[PDB]
Amino acid sequence: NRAYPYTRLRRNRRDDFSRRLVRENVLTVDDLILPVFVLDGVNQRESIPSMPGVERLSIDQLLIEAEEWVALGIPALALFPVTPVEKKSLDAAEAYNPEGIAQRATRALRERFPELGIITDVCLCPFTTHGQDGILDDDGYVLNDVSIDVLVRQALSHAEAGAQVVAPSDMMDGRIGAIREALESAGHTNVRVMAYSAKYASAYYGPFRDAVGSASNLGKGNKATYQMDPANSDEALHEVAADLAEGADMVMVKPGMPYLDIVRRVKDEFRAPTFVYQVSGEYAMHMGAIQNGWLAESVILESLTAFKRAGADGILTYFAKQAAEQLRR
Amino acid sequence: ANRAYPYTRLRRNRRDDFSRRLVRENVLTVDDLILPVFVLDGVNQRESIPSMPGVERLSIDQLLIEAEEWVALGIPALALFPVTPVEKKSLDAAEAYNPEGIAQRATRALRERFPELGIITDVCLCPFTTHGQDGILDDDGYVLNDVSIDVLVRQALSHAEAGAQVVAPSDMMDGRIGAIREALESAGHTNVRVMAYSAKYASAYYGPFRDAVGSNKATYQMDPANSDEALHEVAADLAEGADMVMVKPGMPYLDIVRRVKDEFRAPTFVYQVSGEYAMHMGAIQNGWLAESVILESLTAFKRAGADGILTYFAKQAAEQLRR
Amino acid sequence: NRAYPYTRLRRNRRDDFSRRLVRENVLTVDDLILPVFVLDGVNQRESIPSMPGVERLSIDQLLIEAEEWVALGIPALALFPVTPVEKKSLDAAEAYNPEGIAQRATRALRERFPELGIITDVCLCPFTTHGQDGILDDDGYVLNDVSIDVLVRQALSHAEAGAQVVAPSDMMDGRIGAIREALESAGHTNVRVMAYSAKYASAYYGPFRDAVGSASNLGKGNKATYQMDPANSDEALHEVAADLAEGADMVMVKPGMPYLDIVRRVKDEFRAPTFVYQVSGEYAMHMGAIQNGWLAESVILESLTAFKRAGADGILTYFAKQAAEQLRR
Amino acid sequence: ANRAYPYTRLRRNRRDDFSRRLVRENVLTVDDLILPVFVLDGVNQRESIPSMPGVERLSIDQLLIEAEEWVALGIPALALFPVTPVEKKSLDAAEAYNPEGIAQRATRALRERFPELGIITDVCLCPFTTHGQDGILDDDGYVLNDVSIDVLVRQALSHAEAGAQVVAPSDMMDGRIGAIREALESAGHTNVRVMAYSAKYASAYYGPFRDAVGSNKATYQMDPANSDEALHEVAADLAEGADMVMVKPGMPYLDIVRRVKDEFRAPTFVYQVSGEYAMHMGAIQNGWLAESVILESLTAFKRAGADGILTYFAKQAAEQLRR
Amino acid sequence: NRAYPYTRLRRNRRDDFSRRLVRENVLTVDDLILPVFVLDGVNQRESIPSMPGVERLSIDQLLIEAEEWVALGIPALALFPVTPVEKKSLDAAEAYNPEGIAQRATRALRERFPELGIITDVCLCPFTTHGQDGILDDDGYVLNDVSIDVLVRQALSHAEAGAQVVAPSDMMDGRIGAIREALESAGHTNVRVMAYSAKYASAYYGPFRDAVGSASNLGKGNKATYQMDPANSDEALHEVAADLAEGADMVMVKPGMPYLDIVRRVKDEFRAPTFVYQVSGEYAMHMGAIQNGWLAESVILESLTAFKRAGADGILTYFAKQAAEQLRR
Amino acid sequence: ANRAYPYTRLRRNRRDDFSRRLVRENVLTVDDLILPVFVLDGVNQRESIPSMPGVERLSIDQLLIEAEEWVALGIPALALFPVTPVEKKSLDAAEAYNPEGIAQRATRALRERFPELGIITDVCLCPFTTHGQDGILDDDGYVLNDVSIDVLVRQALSHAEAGAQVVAPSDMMDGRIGAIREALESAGHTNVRVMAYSAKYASAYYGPFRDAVGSNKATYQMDPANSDEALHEVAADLAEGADMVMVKPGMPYLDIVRRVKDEFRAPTFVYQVSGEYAMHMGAIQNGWLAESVILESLTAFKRAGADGILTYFAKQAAEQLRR
Numbered sequence A, C, E: 001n002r003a004y005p006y007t008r009l010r011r012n013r014r015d016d017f018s019r020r021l022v023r024e025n026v027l028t029v030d031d032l033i034l035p036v037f038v039l040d041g042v043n044q045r046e047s048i049p050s051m052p053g054v055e056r057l058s059i060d061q062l063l064i065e066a067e068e069w070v071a072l073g074i075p076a077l078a079l080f081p082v083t084p085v086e087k088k089s090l091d092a093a094e095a096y097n098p099e100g101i102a103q104r105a106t107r108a109l110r111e112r113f114p115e116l117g118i119i120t121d122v123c124l125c126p127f128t129t130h131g132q133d134g135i136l137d138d139d140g141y142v143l144n145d146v147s148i149d150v151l152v153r154q155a156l157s158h159a160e161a162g163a164q165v166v167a168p169s170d171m172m173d174g175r176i177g178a179i180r181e182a183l184e185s186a187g188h189t190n191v192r193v194m195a196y197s198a199k200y201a202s203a204y205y206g207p208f209r210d211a212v213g214s215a216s217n218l219g220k221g222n223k224a225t226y227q228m229d230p231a232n233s234d235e236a237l238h239e240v241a242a243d244l245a246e247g248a249d250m251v252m253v254k255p256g257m258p259y260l261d262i263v264r265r266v267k268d269e270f271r272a273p274t275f276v277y278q279v280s281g282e283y284a285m286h287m288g289a290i291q292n293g294w295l296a297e298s299v300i301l302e303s304l305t306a307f308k309r310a311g312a313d314g315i316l317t318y319f320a321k322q323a324a325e326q327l328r329r
Numbered sequence B, D, F: 001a002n003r004a005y006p007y008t009r010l011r012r013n014r015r016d017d018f019s020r021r022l023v024r025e026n027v028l029t030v031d032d033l034i035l036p037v038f039v040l041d042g043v044n045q046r047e048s049i050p051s052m053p054g055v056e057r058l059s060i061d062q063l064l065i066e067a068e069e070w071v072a073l074g075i076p077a078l079a080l081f082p083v084t085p086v087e088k089k090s091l092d093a094a095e096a097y098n099p100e101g102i103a104q105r106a107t108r109a110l111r112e113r114f115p116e117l118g119i120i121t122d123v124c125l126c127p128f129t130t131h132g133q134d135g136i137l138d139d140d141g142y143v144l145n146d147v148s149i150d151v152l153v154r155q156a157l158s159h160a161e162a163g164a165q166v167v168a169p170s171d172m173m174d175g176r177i178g179a180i181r182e183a184l185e186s187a188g189h190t191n192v193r194v195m196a197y198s199a200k201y202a203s204a205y206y207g208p209f210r211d212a213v214g215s216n217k218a219t220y221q222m223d224p225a226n227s228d229e230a231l232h233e234v235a236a237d238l239a240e241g242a243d244m245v246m247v248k249p250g251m252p253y254l255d256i257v258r259r260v261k262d263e264f265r266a267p268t269f270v271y272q273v274s275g276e277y278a279m280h281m282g283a284i285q286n287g288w289l290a291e292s293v294i295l296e297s298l299t300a301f302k303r304a305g306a307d308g309i310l311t312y313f314a315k316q317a318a319e320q321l322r323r
Ligand SMILES: [K+]
Pocket: A030, A031, A312, A313, A314, D021, D022, D023, D024
């Protein structure tokens, strides 16, 4: 029965102190995960034109930059390997190569910064000649269960490299359970599985496909037989329920700001650790506008606060370092 | 319901276009689209807006030309924003209720020429104040609530008199929806709808609009951190007589859309603001994102529970939907 | 606290534009599934007096008519074979004959129109001399588990013919799970199962039994030991929960408009892909009245909009072509 | 969601600090903290309080000195409690609305010297009555509801006149929130917040506060047994116009905090009272518990759903948070 | 629509009789469980300075004191053994010694007071040289499944001694199910399992670690890799759901008053028998203040009533005897 | 929570008395009990009631004697029902508001002699009308709603004047709770509680009460078939100002108790009526049921969610609870 003018919702807005007292959500560095593009070789740094301010880094250069990310208190990195073209194959075998970029990077980081979380990507897209997330059948369809067998080997390779978290981004049915079963049978009892549970067939990924180098491979291909239809919301709840049942320790929605309603429903429905990925296209859009002088740089912390408000526990964001820097002040 | 792999494989419905179509939960249609327009003072004039690539400010005659195409595409309504000449701004904002102000003129012209097209006028003082704030300022520089409302009510009445089917208070004063509703009923404007901007945030995403209309607000616009508060905003506005309620900005607040729809089951609108437009269009023009993101962003609003979307993409989208 | 005259619910009704903006549901062609009665032979077309405007078609004639249904954007057909009397048996073996009408029709359509969805009917009613949905015991009771064995063979035959969806309409307990288990073990991983979950023992089916030719066989028989009591609503939720658990990809209520409350409860409770069948008797009633001049032809789109409003994702309707034609304008 | 060991091992997230940090559901920040202060009548005076180790009563000048450190640490607000000289107590409690009473003086001094610091004044008669009860007594010794409210309204207005941004009625009279709100609106104090002590229990945990301010209540304060009743208290106070609602005591009533937050989704505060403070500080000083319990107790309030916490630990906590 | 002055919530508060009629919760002796620290040897009584008024008792002295606890109607005791330093080991074997303090005490009490409930503690902390709750790996981490094997042997030893309830306080994943499986396979069909489901990594346990003598062993060690983060609430619901599924007969939150919100959520969500432990630090805080004259002795019954109000069925409290004495008046 | 045999055996908690006690969800205490009394007009008089074995009508002096034992047993309150002499009945029911009527006399006597004992008076015209209906009849023999309320308000005021702490309108007129509340507030009886008989059914279980007090109602009392309707009854009575709400009869309506408690979370009472009493006591006296059914029936009310129970078994139960 709250009614004007007895209730004037502006009164708590009148002064900073009161806005602060009633403020419902804050972003902190504990919320931030920095995705990073990792090159083969030594002394390599490459600018990504469709992600201004983000560079692909060789492992030695990654280790250097990580000193500052650690000093800033960023909890974890999410690694994405930029696989050399010649190491792409129909069988995606590079995915489980102990000498692959992801596995070498993991080992290096785990030794140099033992408290830093490493989240590896479980997916065949960086490894396939066609750029799809799994292995194709003779009709060009991404086979579910055959792909899982490769994903499982990948995941085990990561666990062997020391990754504390593996994050299946492939959208095969059942892969969370298969990976978990494998990790448990192998003794990797504490390796976390951060499921990409509600990952949509989105247009917002374009820049990442450029950054990881799968854009050329995929071409005009689409992922609608596995990634989710943008139109669907209830379906996301079913996706997440399965992944929880299958043993996921964290569940993720991707992309991010275009899907904040999904973040809210998922958090509300399951009350489980919920993550969101602020994808390459989101980062690019924001950067492009800030660089043009169309949006103030305050939009970065507004965008990230939105995720907290919607119910995410953690955010994968290419803004993680700038945000951590702003928070540190 | 104990759904478990492999008895349940959620990919099966995704296998084919036909089954994707059958199960698709939401669709965007032209019926969902409302186009905001920036309206100039002369004749035979258009102006480009540096921070909104592709959007033109339009004099009324130009508006009427373009509206023929908008109506033909089935866009149901426009939301008008006047670009007030500097010389007509004042501390009292009286131009807001001038019967020959741009908004009022534009409205009468449109109502006569396209009687089926909905016209949503903006009730707010920000295009009219020397200072660009949304209400009348006190000596400390604070936006005065109830004094501002008196101006707003006069504005809204002038819009009604001009023929506006919908007035949309975007000012975020407390209690303004009720005051406006009371004045419209008392004047006999029994069917003029009020589209409340109920949960309007103190956002950085509005920068380009200020460039567009030619016009610090944390004492009235909402803290981006706050979600529960939006439900209290909305509840008051429904009780006060709003016919529709709106969340602004849009994409950055899709969670609020969903909560608002779910809690009240009332006609719910969302504003895809100038900065959302600009970042999308900038990225598409830079070749960084595909054109397809336009419809993906609009489908998100529908999925989140919006009934209608105020969007600078309305004509592009309507075109895409007609193909 | 909404109260007159502050709140006048007529204001949004005042003008078309505002009614359009606030309109809660729309029907689109993406919602439509056309059931079709399929004859043996060549060059055969037969009018059904109790379903005015609907014809039984031989496969060649079906293929011709399907060009227009495809051009209209109708997503799928649901096939119902008109089995020759001489091919009815106690064992219902025709149900799994690779040369049966349903299996031949499926193969023909899958080749001619590869994007068109084909939903086959899994049920023994077109195949039994007695017109019941399963195999009878020596007391005249429809045996549950023995019937499932035949249903399973049927379903596999359909999958082998290329059907993208099989739709068990039999109301045996457990058949969704048994069919799913069979499809999975045989490698038909992506064959959808559209369960008739809440199918009631209704009087509204009379015309269909005429159209498929099971009316004579069933006679005065009833299906109350398997189809649901019209009086029961909570029971429908239990029926649907089982079918979801058993692996259904879609769940259906039948009949349709007489059961819209069930559609609403099912959608609300499970948030799963929900379908509704506007049965023969519903079509006949409406057609009869329109032909008499008692109801305007606008009732067709009103009837279909009701299903959307009640929460159905898709509608099996003999009006699918007229509706698609009206929508296309 | 059918989570089952060993597919689900809830220890995995606990394995490492980084994953503990990622999933941690609540954090305390300085923004959550409100420091209650006991304010004396002279100059250059502090007094120690036997039952609140480490808390000093402060004359206004001393308050202003300490407030520089409080503001520097980012504490958003103070809640003032005057220590009335015995000679100013009376049966009518008139000192409550004296414009040169301690609270009023302290407020004007603070508002001038630290304009951004929030000042929460106490609306209650207990520091002012010869008898120490929270309202005016009838011949049977019963606290009179509506008579007491009239005094309270005059008090609240005097605080508003002194510049208080928030008045916090702690009296537990029925209907006082509405009466105060009505009087503030009618006087033009449109933005003075009211922080209702909505669910305030008849508790043994207040003993040390009475020692601190220098001041049997089961006919107005709530029965500790009752939970549902708290929701009815809160609902009335929201309807009456409260901007914030409070549960007191705190830790012993964390269930009430949670229910109150969950039911109303409104700005919810909690008072970690003098006895909670004393038992913690006594135990820490006795070496029986680690200092870490301070932040653990404060994190509990956040977890339970409180937006802000009135706590004598606010400065210690703010210090810990700044390291 | 309740509004002043039609509704004045003070009216039921006006008189004792009406406060009594509407009083929502009462504490009774049926709610009380007394934890007790048990020494080896004969004729031993030891005061605990950080728990004023509580003594560690040898078994003969326990039996004497139990006469009064039984006369007061206290339903159950929770036993905590003060293990001799020399009987601590890396393998925690003393935990399952049939001649251990807990097992001897159980047997003695079960014979002397057959109606008195005995709740034994299942945990390795009193038995390990390092004071952690399980067995450590070579990185110093408490191994989950190896620890469960020892916990299981412990639990079986208690059941063999006659304990009616075993209470696992160890916070290993899955231990409820493993213990239950063991009890059932051994024929201990009616031995209750009182799970410590939501046991937090708290500072409030200090005095107990002194009383049981594990303080020296643990040193500065922490239990954050198994006990719950104080910040987390939703996580508690997941913890309890697992333990119910695994067969717990009662579920517990620990500590107590600092976690009353958890008690409320757990009771509300599961409607199962819910217990709360008013830990050593809570008892000490209260006692310290009462002894200083800072709080009246009425705080004891206020503190206990809080637990009832929050939804607990039973309370483990070192105040159980004083409270029972006050209630008996 | 996937509890399944044999991991879950619900018998384990049942194995032993101690664990049965630990998990027992509800307990009856003396605090739950309210004893209804039938009060006669002379002196040194008691009468037995044929259809209520063991219950006596008591003159006031006898009431006072017995009340010493009731108070000693801790019974919190009595509910008085006067046995009006035939000569004082009338079509206007004026005896209802006679200051020297039985109820009023009994109340003053009790309030003086046992000031802590709660006195609940009956507001209803049925003991006062020549015809025994609960209100004033029109020419068609219909119980007039608003006319009856005027009498009821005068009655209630007379009870307040006599010292009653609680008035309990049992008449089932629409809107009477509000009318009574308004009149009590307007007269200054600010703390007189109103215990609404909110969901009072047109039941066959009342037969023996009519024998007891010496006093067709389907146009005002509720249809036993109806459950949802009870929630609407209760909601109105809370909004109207009831302090407590009651369901009558009791056992035959335990579902209503539970729904009422669950929906409103307000102080909820239940009447174990004369016919419930009689069938139990008759069966116990016939040797067909054990005495234990008394406490089992009372525990049911607590389990169903009642805060207090009006019961002719209150003294027996209190005695059993004291052993
Ligand atoms: K977080």
